[PDB]
């Protein structure tokens, strides 16, 4: 983990839209803090897997045994929007979280194909079957049109540290400020 330019940090400011440097850097912080349990794919992983297939992301897990982890977090970027896919390995459930009710199950199948492929190459027979889609659950939704990135990062923190979603729209200003300081310190300030 490392430090961001001041203008990337500024995307947390006010009601500005989070960009990829904030998303990816906080992901780094999150798995810096629980590295045996969580693997965080960066926000470019999905586009690359979609426009260039398993051969375009093959080498990104060169140093990771995905299947020893408990939780994979995969931030999804949709034009103007941040969303989140999670893979819980213990029970082979792929989930899709979004703070504006958007349903994109069309892309969790790309993920499923990805996981079955990776399992084949990493000689992991216990993961060549069994993947489920998650039964959708009530998670905190946003009431403005700018906090999707902030919601996605807070879902990641909560899932990573195994906390409940104990937050709502009115906490977002404080969370933007917490994420900002955590980023300046390169550590999660629980």
């Amino acid at each position: 983990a490392s430090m961001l330019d001041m203008d990337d940090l500024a995307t947390l400011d006010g009601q500005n839209w989070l960009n990829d440097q904030v998303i990816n850097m906080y992901g780094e912080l999150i798995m810096d803090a629980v590295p045996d349990k969580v693997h965080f794919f960066n926000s470019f992983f999905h586009r690359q897997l979609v426009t260039k297939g398993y051969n375009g992301v093959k080498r990104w897990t060169k140093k990771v045994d995905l299947f020893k982890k408990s939780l994979l977090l995969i931030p999804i970027h949709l034009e103007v929007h941040w969303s989140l896919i999670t893979v819980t390995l213990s029970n082979r459930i792929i989930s899709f979280y979004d703070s504006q009710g958007i349903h994109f199950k069309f892309c969790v199948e790309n993920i499923r194909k990805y996981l079955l492929t990776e399992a084949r190459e990493k000689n992991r027979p216990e993961f060549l079957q069994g993947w489920q889609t998650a039964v959708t659950k009530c998670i905190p939704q946003q009431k403005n049109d700018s906090d999707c990135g902030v919601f996605v990062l807070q879902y990641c923190k909560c899932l990573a540290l195994e906390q409940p979603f104990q937050f709502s729209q009115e906490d977002m200003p404080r969370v933007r400020k917490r994420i900002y300081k955590e980023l300046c310190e390169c550590r999660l300030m629980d």
């Binding site: 839209w17 989070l18 990829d20 970027h77 941040w82």
Partner: protein, 77 residues
Amino acid sequence: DHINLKVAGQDGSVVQFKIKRHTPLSKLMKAYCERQGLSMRQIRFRFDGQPINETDTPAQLEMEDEDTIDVFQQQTG
């Protein structure tokens, strides 16, 4: 001790470079920007999905001959 490196963009473009495995990659990143008209605060250089720092070398990133560097764009949402 030169090495060949490809720099692949979101537009499908590909550009080749010779660089010594122990020079820092900042000269390739700045070369690639000037040549393509790109603003370097709007693009991101990544090798095997990992970010590349200005000071990083092909050697300490463990690159080999003809390896590929991907360039991505700012995302907001």
